[PDB]
């Protein structure tokens, strides 16, 4: 009654086992408001002398 039960499958040719679990959560939000204002004017001084 001791736990030195290494009578089968002695793998100590080092055998480094890894694990790498990885989760990720991500939300996002935007609010993009523009507002234009624009006005024009001109003048059209024309002439013709037939």
């Amino acid at each position: 009654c001791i736990t030195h039960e290494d009578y089968l499958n002695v793998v100590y040719s080092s055998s480094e086992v890894e694990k790498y679990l990885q989760s990720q959560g991500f939300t996002e939000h935007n609010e993009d408001t523009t507002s234009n204002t624009d006005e024009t004017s001109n003048q059209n001084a024309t002439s013709l002398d037939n």
């Binding site: 234009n36 624009d38 006005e39 004017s41 001109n42 001084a45 002439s47 037939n50």
Partner: peptide, 21 residues
Amino acid sequence: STGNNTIDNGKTVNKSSNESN
């Protein structure tokens, strides 16, 4: 010019201001 020989001359002046913001 025909074969009287009408002649014309024209001028236009066109400013156009603008702005936007």
